[PDB]
Ligand binder design. Sequence first.
Ligand SMILES: O=C(O)CCc1c[nH]c2ccccc12
Length: 121
Amino acid sequence: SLLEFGKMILEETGKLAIPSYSSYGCYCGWGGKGTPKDATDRCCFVHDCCYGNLPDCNPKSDRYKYKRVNGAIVCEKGTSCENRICECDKAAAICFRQNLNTYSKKYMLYPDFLCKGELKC
Ligand SMILES: O=C(O)CCc1c[nH]c2ccccc12
């Protein structure tokens, strides 16, 4: 659920999910359309696509368990939806960490009309 995902993001990047990643670019937050603005926005796009492969799961509210093995994120065994949701979130948190150097505040609160284009998962 968003509770685990937010904690994962803070641990990984030092930034608070909200406000740092809830209104960033075209895909971090709201849903999504257009071309990702940058690497961090692409992390969100892929994350949305990852959730997209789990039609009968509920990523935002279904809670899962995960632990840290010397920094490494390890998803603990739960239901099948929980396992897959955790893997999607783990991937995004790492992607965010990997692109911290290019994170740009000019993409915070990015306006909707500037998200033009096509990008299928
Ligand atoms: O409801 C969600 O779509 C947006 C609010 C939200 C809570 N925790 C988050 C962690 C990362 C990105 C967005 C969020």
